[PDB]
Amino acid sequence: EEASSTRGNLDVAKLNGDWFSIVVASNKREKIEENGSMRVFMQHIDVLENSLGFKFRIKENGECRELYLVAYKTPEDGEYFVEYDGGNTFTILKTDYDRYVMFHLINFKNGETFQLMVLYGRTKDLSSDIKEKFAKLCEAHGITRDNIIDLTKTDRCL
Amino acid sequence: EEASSTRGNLDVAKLNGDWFSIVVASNKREKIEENGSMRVFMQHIDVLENSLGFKFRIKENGECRELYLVAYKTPEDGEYFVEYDGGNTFTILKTDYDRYVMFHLINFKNGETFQLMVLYGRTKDLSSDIKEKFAKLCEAHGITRDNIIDLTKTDRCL
Amino acid sequence: EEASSTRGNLDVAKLNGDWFSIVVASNKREKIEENGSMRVFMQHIDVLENSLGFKFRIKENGECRELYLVAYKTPEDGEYFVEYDGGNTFTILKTDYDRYVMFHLINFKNGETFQLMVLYGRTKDLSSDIKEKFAKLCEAHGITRDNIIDLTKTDRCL
């Protein structure tokens, strides 16, 4: 079941399909709150040539926008790059393919950098076990529970 | 004088201006020979917002093409990303700003990866000391002298 | 039922969803034959902000590639732009939303320009009436029947 990019046994092809934003976390809370550049409502991941395509809605000024971004695979094992509100590097922390997928992102913009962790799921919501499991990883990565936000409880531009 | 991105004391702003391709090296020689995707003839580097712009000519099918690429700064110290003939990551190995600049690049395309090192200079040519100094770094990075090519001796789409 | 972009009554939002490549036509046949830059096997159209996203497979060197392109709406009524094997301009010639969609494209690359017409359908194939109807429009646009190719008869990277 489980796989990671840092383990090399990740079959990226199975990540293709529909995904929903379940939980976001970051010690740069500003970024994941109402109007934050990172409060994304995932819709679909496309597996392309040495790249991943993301279709998602983001609410700007109270209005949902339809955005699409292409992330390119880099030479650093399991790493992907994407230009969005700065230079972003991310990796697939863990996934079971048919339920959840956990991404760990590092942003860079004007000298400063911050981390981001997201729990995208195949269903509009996931079991607490998973959300709890995610929460634990966020803390392990230095993200306090105050900066973990459950999006299933709010509007996700649906 | 000297500065590097891996030392953090790099003032990228001083890299702005005109640059010429002096020497290229790679153990994937195919890439740096006549018609190789990497046999680039640098012209100008633009320092932009969290990115670097490169204007260069590349000879395809005996015809010089005018190309421009934007590389984005990543969260990994001194690293930049650029999509060109695959996913590329590179860093400024060493520079004195007013004469030379040495770049170290790692390419990724369809599972395989190769290294590239270039000696871009502010004048159509550089002293042998420098070329020798570059050659030594290429070898230190596992690049044999047979794969170091002096472009000042050939046509550079000038 | 029927709508066009040149009639202004086109509800682009209904073009969202899955589409298949049924028939391609162009008097630059080279472009639509085995290995041609235009022999695309459509998969999905995404309606985005003032743009359209296309997910399609194209067979290069006997190997199917997963590609995604974003086309931007232009000020010229019903026109969209997309950079792919040159500068492309296209319009939705006709559509009934639930079955077929006909696109007319004009490519530009290195001084020369050529036309392209495609019949993308919601099912792996369409009735002959439609294919015949398409064929007639291709001829009206100066495309001879020899340059109209039925892709349902060949491999479409499925």
Next chain:
Amino acid sequence: EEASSTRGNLDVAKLNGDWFSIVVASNKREKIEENGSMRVFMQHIDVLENSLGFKFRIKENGECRELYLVAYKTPEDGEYFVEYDGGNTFTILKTDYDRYVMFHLINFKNGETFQLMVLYGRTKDLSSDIKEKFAKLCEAHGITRDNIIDLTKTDRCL
């Protein structure tokens, strides 16, 4: 001397080099005032493969940003496309190559469209004859003198 894209005798290659923003005009004044998406301070035009590269500074929130945009040539004679604050189409209205260049742009964003005309010059300023000549063309294109702004009189992120 004089040439236009609508006359087909335009040698785009001679537009390569440094350019300064002399005068901007638009009946969507909001766009060309302090903080307007169109109040651009041109720096350099790069002639590339079926495209034009623009390096310019734009003052956002009192801070000058370094931006670079690539515009692609389209099949419509003399027309170029560029995605910036919407879909843009533009043409070179008139130029003498060594002094001035006049661009006419049409923007499209969320159903609405507006025109823009710019007088980019090779020197920090141009003779009144030229500015007057430009002003006249702006009026001919329905742009009133109140919406013509002389940038040489203000800060141009220099």
